[PDB]
Amino acid sequence: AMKVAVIGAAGGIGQALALLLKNRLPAGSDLALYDIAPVTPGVAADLSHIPTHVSIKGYAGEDPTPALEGADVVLISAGVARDRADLFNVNAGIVKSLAERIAVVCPNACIGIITNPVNTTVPIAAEVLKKAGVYDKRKLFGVTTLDVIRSETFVAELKGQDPGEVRVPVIGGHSGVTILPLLSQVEGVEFSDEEIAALTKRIQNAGTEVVEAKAGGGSATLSMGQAACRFGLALVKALQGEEVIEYAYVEGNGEHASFFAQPVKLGKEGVEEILPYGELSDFEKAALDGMLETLNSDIQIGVDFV
Amino acid sequence: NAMKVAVIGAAGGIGQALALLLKNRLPAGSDLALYDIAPVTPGVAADLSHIPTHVSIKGYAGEDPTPALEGADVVLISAGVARADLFNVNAGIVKSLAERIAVVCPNACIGIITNPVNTTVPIAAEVLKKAGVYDKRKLFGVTTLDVIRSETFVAELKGQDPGEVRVPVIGGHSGVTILPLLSQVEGVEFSDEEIAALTKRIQNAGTEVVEAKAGGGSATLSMGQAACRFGLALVKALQGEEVIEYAYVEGNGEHASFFAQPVKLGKEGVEEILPYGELSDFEKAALDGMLETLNSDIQIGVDFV
Numbered sequence: 298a299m300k301v302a303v304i305g306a307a308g309g310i311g312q313a314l315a316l317l318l319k320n321r322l323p324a325g326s327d328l329a330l331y332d333i334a335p336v337t338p339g340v341a342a343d344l345s346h347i348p349t350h351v352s353i354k355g356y357a358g359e360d361p362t363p364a365l366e367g368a369d370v371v372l373i374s375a376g377v378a379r380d381r382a383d384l385f386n387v388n389a390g391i392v393k394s395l396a397e398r399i400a401v402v403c404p405n406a407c408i409g410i411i412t413n414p415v416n417t418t419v420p421i422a423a424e425v426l427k428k429a430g431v432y433d434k435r436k437l438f439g440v441t442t443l444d445v446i447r448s449e450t451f452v453a454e455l456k457g458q459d460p461g462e463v464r465v466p467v468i469g470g471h472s473g474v475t476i477l478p479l480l481s482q483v484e485g486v487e488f489s490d491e492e493i494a495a496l497t498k499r500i501q502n503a504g505t506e507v508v509e510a511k512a513g514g515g516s517a518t519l520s521m522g523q524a525a526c527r528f529g530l531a532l533v534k535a536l537q538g539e540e541v542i543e544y545a546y547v548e549g550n551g552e553h554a555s556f557f558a559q560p561v562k563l564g565k566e567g568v569e570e571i572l573p574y575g576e577l578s579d580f581e582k583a584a585l586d587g588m589l590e591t592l593n594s595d596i597q598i599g600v601d602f603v
Numbered sequence: 604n605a606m607k608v609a610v611i612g613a614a615g616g617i618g619q620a621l622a623l624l625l626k627n628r629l630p631a632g633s634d635l636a637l638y639d640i641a642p643v644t645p646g647v648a649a650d651l652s653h654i655p656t657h658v659s660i661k662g663y664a665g666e667d668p669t670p671a672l673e674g675a676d677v678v679l680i681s682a683g684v685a686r687a688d689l690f691n692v693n694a695g696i697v698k699s700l701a702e703r704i705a706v707v708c709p710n711a712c713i714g715i716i717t718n719p720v721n722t723t724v725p726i727a728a729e730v731l732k733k734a735g736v737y738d739k740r741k742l743f744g745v746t747t748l749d750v751i752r753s754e755t756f757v758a759e760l761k762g763q764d765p766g767e768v769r770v771p772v773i774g775g776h777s778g779v780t781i782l783p784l785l786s787q788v789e790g791v792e793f794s795d796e797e798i799a800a801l802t803k804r805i806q807n808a809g810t811e812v813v814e815a816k817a818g819g820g821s822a823t824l825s826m827g828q829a830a831c832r833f834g835l836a837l838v839k840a841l842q843g844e845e846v847i848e849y850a851y852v853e854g855n856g857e858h859a860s861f862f863a864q865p866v867k868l869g870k871e872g873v874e875e876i877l878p879y880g881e882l883s884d885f886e887k888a889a890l891d892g893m894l895e896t897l898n899s900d901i902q903i904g905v906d907f908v
Contacts, residue, residue, distance in 0.1 A: 312823075313623055315824070316827070338815045340824070342815035347825050348768070350765055511646025515643050517653065519654075
């Protein structure tokens, strides 16, 4: 029986995530929602009327301790969704403050940070945990699953494949040119040069696509909830004893950057083993070398912040 | 064949939850059209289109829902908002929608979520009649949220598996018109105190969520869950599967012209209006006691058209 906490539960991402988790967490699970917005207990009440064997509670107020206590997995969707400087000034401090409390209430929890900019918020979290002297790099993750599902959808669409069965690895970071989909590794599929360029570009700018369709009035919230649910369930299955392989931004062996997204074997302690991403085409190797300066910069910004 | 489901009021809380669940659960090959006056609607569809499920999705914003209604097999209406000004608004919205439906997709199964359902369903029916296309087998007041709430509460109370507990609910969709048939719950025995507590909690569950939301919102996620269940049920039925559901429909009229009870869904919408079974004395007294209220809610709708 695992307990999953969703921080920032009142926002669009948070509510989509909470709804899917109430429906998909294994029977007997516990789900805790926290958000300073006073509507939070009501979001939990709303969801508590759904007949699944998953207990749910919601907390508002200025203290997330009730949600964090005994939490096995903590999904951070605090702050505001996405210029670059504004997003950072709001979200960086919010993540740092949460991480500080997480370090004391549930330092053994697996932490999945959804809050952007992920390339930087994960390092912020890591440094806060280190100052507390409880940092376990096997338990800190930047949720990059949205890049993965978007890639599966777009590839499946272009090649008339079943979107539910298509696998598209994605490595690197979670923004702009740092998002590197490994189209060369897609099983059974072959892409032309223009298809590689077109798909890579769309995957890297997919967020903008949604914002524009909303005429500037919002961002990708439902698909982000979907992606975070998928990652959250992967963590929970791993904690319960099943071997799970997933793509995420973690502190690996550091051949390219202190933090880098690649496949990982998940287990009872979080990351069980950092798995090499495999062979890359020339386009992918050039893409990787061309975004490392940006990725390492995003990381330094987070280290310097703490 | 593939079915097309249209969600009217797709940008709101209920609507986005419904759309998310439909994108994930509709059978492969399905088409999903989202519509709402809110300018963000096309982006809600775009957001959802990024989910890897074999379900096509499009979104439209504007005053005219025609593109979403065109070729729709199922139309789920969740437009409006959650006193007299508010009713006039939702009534007007439902009336306008029914008018467009009469012209664009008169053969679609219509599921109304927009409250007050007791009144908005008759509004739609009266509009459809005036357009000469009313088919009472295809108009439903979605009362599914009352059913899943009842399932949840009974399960928690008697330590049952929530996914297995069955609790019929008849009557109307608001206050004293909501009648959970706790006497028909198999494998459990309720005390008089529990019967009273459960009934009161089921009838006032909407207020419970509004209060928990500090008065700045109502049930959206659970309502989306409920509408998804009813929506999928209609799709399965249109695809040839015998499905039994609880819904507010124009039945035999033993108690009110529109009344919620079990119905057998088929390829033409309502295939058969089924009896709701035996009632306990408490349930009968509750039924007798809501008649004046339910029929007046229907009257209010008829008067509006």
